Design a protein around this ligand. Structure first.
Ligand code: ZN
Lengths: 73, 144, 73, 314, 73, 86, 73, 192
């Protein structure tokens, strides 16, 4: 529970300018992207990767490909 | 008789449980795999819970109703009706105490409200997730 | 055996058998004619699970007239 | 910020039982061959130092206070070395116990029983052979897990040697399945096993495992089992009417003939006596009673007495 | 076929070292074991055997050989 | 036809165990409190000759001669003695 | 909302049986001798056939054919 | 513990809880609660009083909330009997008891040898959950499951529910001298 909307793009590595193009129309997510904990692309990884599993402190490399393992795989 | 005014409830202290029990079950064994007998010092052990056959000791020295209220010296089984197996209780002597989980986990937590401890913190204590200070020496700490 | 019973065994001279009677008896409230039998012996090879020797199935049938209380629709 | 998240990860209680154990076992660094040899010598030194002081307790000879304080520190260090070696190889026990789950033993019980194997592994380990500790400890941990499963996991406990023959019976049965494409009948199983066919079924009968009385199939199975020792009303009432009839039949007879029959079968007393015991009460030889027993039996078989007792055959 | 698509999911089986692999293919079926009448009579399931091909390949070391496997009735 | 015997466990309790008057009084009995206890009056019929369990010292003696441990102890004891001397 | 058919329902159990088997094969290929083992060494189909046998019975989808008349069947 | 360890004492598990209950004043806690309830207006301190006052009025020591011994139910109420051709059926309590006795004895073996606290404490919590699963299974965490993921019946499961001792075998029962059948019209019958 308790998940933001815009953390996923930074989690996937999406560049910030791409969000404005797609989400710029009809506001919405742009306002959701305006309010966020952190804007760091790699920082969003460490924020979301720990939220789900928070046990056994997360590794840097293990958290990057974990989402590809959890979904893309 | 079926005429008694009241029936009272309460908590059973470790001594109350020991007085109920006719013996300690020392092994997690039910019945022998070959003879299918209630192996001794386990569950169903006739040494404590009573005999399987009416007025019969385990080894078969006393098979008749002449002698009752006696215990076979060899097999250690009391000679009496087999119905006692329904009413006779045992007990287990623990090597370390345990919470009842009815008072701890049941909301509101009885141990929680009793010791002014939070349930989240109380769970950490009894399941060995964190330590607790049982006693401090307030005087000696103050001197040094 | 008790003292009372086992007195009749002496007068009537019927030796108490080591075996106990466990038979197959038709239950309460039914009747009919035996249609067929199916028997699987262990002496004959057949096929049987561990512990079982002889397996017998009896098929009983009956002609049911329409009776008071039967359900029509 | 990763440091803060790292501290939060170390500090998590977790509801799961096996997790909290994985955290505490992963908090002690592993070892290399050199450290293992070091801990082994500390353990043996502390043990020998403890026994030397034990020889002094009976023999006295209080040693110099500096040597006596250092001897007891070696024992202090020896025990710390033993605890350190176990806490380091506590994870090997876990890595071996994973494969034995789903057999009827809980995961934690498999892990703890494996830890017991690790204790004896350290107690019996030898560092002079130059072999890694994991080499020798693997044997003791597996043996402790398997030996525990044979002595526990079965509701009706089976001895080790019987569990041994069953597993071989199963492996022989699974290979014969691969060879013949059909389930081997006991004759083929007894042949492969060097034992008689009538023995294998008995062994297969032991392999039966109990079922829970509380299984639901809505009302659960337990409600379908009728009490076998429960007293039936008709038979209990018939036994009383049968006692009433025997009294009247036995009442017509010689008072000394009736006494012989009562003592012979026990009746009132309940313990069937013998001819010699009945001979001391009536003051006659055991032969004279057999004559009395035969004459009263033919008088009992005679129809006037027995015509009423026909219904009581059973 | 439903079998072919599940075997495609299982193919191949690798040890995580990449040195060896286990491949499945070619599901094979033969005539049924007994007629349905004889099955309903003998209390035995009505089934036909299953055959497949399993190749064990290890070319890191000396190459292994194939075989014909029987999954069951 | 029943004579009663009493026993005392190691913690100080006491229990009455009825027996047959024609029977043989045992020396020790398993009591309902979980322990065992000695007979009330008749003292010490048998020692039972219980053998001690094997210890870490017994397992170490098989793999080491006394001199080997002795030599190793001197090597270990003089090591800490080197820190004392510094 | 789609209808899972008989063939597909059986497929899912075969998938579970094969997945339950690879755990044995993956654990077997590593620690079982070397180089000569081949599928004969360790391929245990017991979990595979168990998934089938355990499905046709005890499963809510597989039911005793209801036959009072040819219509009910 | 290294430094300052001689000025205090600490522990974990039910052992420490038993010690906190051993030194406890239900009066001092109540009297302090009675002046804190009104002076610090508090609602949570009032609800806590009911349990503190309950122990104060009766003569039962709060020590009863921790078990140094577990009673064993008679065998005939947890029966193990055979039905068809030798196969057996037994109650779930026997295995719930088995997990308790097994883990209790393994704890005795670890203590005599001496063991690192990691292994002993791990065994102690296992004993804690085994006794929990016995009394109430599934109340804390996942329930102890049998073959095919069937939760074992626990002592508490015997009383609760429509199938418990109350609504099943107490407030209603199956009786003798009774029967049933379909009903047809009795138009010629008298009202009685
Ligand atoms: Zn006896």
């Amino acid at each position: 529970r308790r998940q933001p909307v815009t953390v996923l793009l930074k989690a996937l590595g999406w560049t910030n300018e791409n969000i404005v193009e797609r989400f710029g129309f009809s506001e919405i997510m742009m306002g959701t992207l305006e309010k966020d904990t952190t804007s760091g692309t790699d920082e969003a990884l460490l924020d979301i990767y720990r939220k789900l599993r928070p046990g056994e402190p997360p590794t840097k490399e293990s958290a990057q490909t974990l989402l590809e393992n959890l979904f893309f795989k | 008789v079926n005429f008694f005014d009241e029936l009272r409830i309460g908590l059973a202290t470790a001594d109350d449980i020991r007085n109920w029990s006719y013996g300690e079950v020392k092994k997690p064994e039910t019945i022998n795999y070959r003879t299918l007998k209630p192996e001794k010092d386990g569950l169903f052990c006739e040494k404590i819970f009573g005999p399987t056959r009416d007025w019969e000791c385990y080894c078969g020295k006393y098979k008749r109703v002449r002698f009752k209220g006696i215990i076979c010296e060899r097999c250690g089984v009391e000679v009496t009706r087999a119905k006692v197996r329904r009413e006779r209780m045992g007990h287990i002597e623990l090597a370390a105490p345990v919470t009842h989980i009815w008072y701890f986990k049941g909301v509101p937590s009885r141990l929680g409200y009793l010791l002014d401890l939070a349930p989240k913190d109380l769970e950490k204590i009894i399941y060995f997730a964190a330590y607790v200070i049982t006693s401090v020496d307030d005087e000696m700490r103050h001197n040094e | 055996l008790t003292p009372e019973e086992r007195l009749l065994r002496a007068i009537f001279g019927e030796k108490a058998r080591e075996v106990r009677d466990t038979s197959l008896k038709v239950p309460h409230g039914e009747s009919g004619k035996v249609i067929g039998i199916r028997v699987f012996s262990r002496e004959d090879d057949d096929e049987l699970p561990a512990g079982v020797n002889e397996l017998v199935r009896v098929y009983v049938a009956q002609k049911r007239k329409i009776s008071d209380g039967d359900k029509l629709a | 910020a990763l440091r803060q998240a790292r501290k939060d990860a170390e500090l998590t209680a977790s509801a799961d039982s096996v997790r909290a154990y994985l955290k505490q076992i992963g908090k002690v660094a592993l070892l290399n061959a050199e450290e293992e040899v070091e801990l082994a010598k500390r353990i043996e030194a502390g043990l020998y130092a403890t026994q030397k002081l034990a020889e002094l307790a009976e023999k006295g000879e209080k040693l110099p206070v500096q040597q006596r304080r250092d001897m007891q520190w070696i024992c202090r260090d020896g025990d710390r070395a033993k605890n350190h070696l176990l806490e380091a190889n506590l994870r090997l026990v876990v890595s071996l116990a994973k494969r034995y789950t789903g057999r009827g033993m809980a995961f934690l019980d498999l892990i703890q029983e494996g830890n017991l194997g690790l204790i004896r592994a350290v107690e019996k380990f030898d560092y002079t052979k130059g072999y890694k500790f994991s080499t020798y400890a693997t044997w003791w941990i597996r043996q402790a897990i398997t030996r525990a499963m044979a002595d526990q996991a079965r509701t009706i406990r089976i001895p080790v040697h019987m569990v041994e023959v069953i597993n071989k019976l199963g492996r022989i049965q699974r290979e014969l399945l691969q060879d013949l494409g059909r389930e081997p009948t006991p004759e083929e199983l007894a042949k492969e096993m060097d034992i008689t066919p009538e023995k294998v079924l008995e062994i297969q009968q032991y392999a039966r495992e109990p079922i829970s009385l509380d299984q639901t199939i809505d009302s659960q199975l337990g409600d379908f089992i009728e009490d076998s020792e429960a007293v039936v009303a008709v038979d209990a009432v018939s036994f009383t009417l049968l006692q009433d009839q025997l009294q009247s039949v036995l009442e017509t007879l010689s008072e000394r003939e009736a006494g012989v029959v009562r003592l012979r079968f026990g009746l009132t007393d309940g313990q069937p006596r013998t001819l010699d015991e009945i001979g001391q009460v009536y003051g006659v030889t055991r032969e004279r009673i057999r004559q009395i027993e035969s004459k009263t039996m033919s008088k009992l078989r005679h129809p006037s007495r027995s015509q009423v007792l026909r219904d009581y055959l059973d | 076929g439903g079998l072919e698509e599940v075997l495609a999911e299982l193919s191949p089986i690798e040890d995580f070292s990449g040195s060896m692999s286990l491949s499945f293919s070619d599901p094979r079926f033969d005539e049924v074991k007994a007629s349905v009448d004889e099955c309903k009579d003998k209390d035995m399931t009505y089934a036909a055997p299953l055959f497949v091909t399993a190749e064990f390949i290890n070319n890191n070391t000396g190459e292994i050989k194939s075989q014909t496997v029987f999954m069951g009735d | 036809p029943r004579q009663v015997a009493r026993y005392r466990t190691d913690n100080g309790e006491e229990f009455d165990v009825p027996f047959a008057d024609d029977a043989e009084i045992p020396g020790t009995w398993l009591c309902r409190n979980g322990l065992e206890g000695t007979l009330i009056e008749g003292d010490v019929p048998e020692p039972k000759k219980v053998k001690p369990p094997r210890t870490h010292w017994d397992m170490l003696l098989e793999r080491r001669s006394v001199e080997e441990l002795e030599e190793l102890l001197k090597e270990r004891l003089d090591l800490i003695k080197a820190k004392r001397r510094g | 909302r789609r209808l899972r058919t008989v063939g597909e329902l059986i497929q899912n159990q075969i998938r579970v049986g094969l997945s339950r088997m690879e755990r044995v094969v993956r654990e077997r290929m590593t620690t079982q001798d070397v180089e000569a083992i081949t599928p004969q060494t360790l391929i245990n189909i017991r979990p595979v056939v168990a998934a089938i046998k355990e499905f046709f019975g005890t499963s809510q989808l597989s039911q005793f054919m209801d036959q009072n008349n040819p219509l009910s069947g | 513990q290294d430094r300052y360890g001689e000025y205090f004492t600490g522990a974990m598990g039910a052992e420490s809880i038993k010690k906190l209950i051993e030194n406890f004043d239900i009066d001092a806690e109540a009297e302090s609660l009675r002046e804190v309830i009104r002076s610090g207006k508090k609602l949570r301190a009032l609800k806590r009083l009911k349990v503190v006052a309950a122990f104060q009025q009766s003569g039962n020591s709060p020590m009863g909330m921790v078990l140094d011994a577990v009673p064993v139910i008679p065998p005939e109420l947890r029966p193990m009997v055979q039905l068809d051709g030798g196969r057996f059926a037994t109650s779930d309590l026997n295995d719930l008891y088995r997990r308790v006795i097994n883990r209790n004895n393994r704890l005795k073996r670890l203590i005599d040898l001496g063991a690192p606290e990691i292994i002993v404490n791990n065994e102690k919590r296992m004993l804690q959950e085994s006794v929990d699963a016995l009394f109430d299974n599934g109340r804390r965490g996942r329930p102890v499951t049998g073959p095919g993921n069937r939760p074992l019946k626990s002592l508490s499961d015997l009383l609760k529910g429509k199938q418990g001792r109350f609504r099943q075998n107490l407030l209603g029962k199956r009786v003798d001298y009774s029967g049933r059948s379909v009903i047809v019209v009795g138009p010629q019958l008298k009202l009685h």
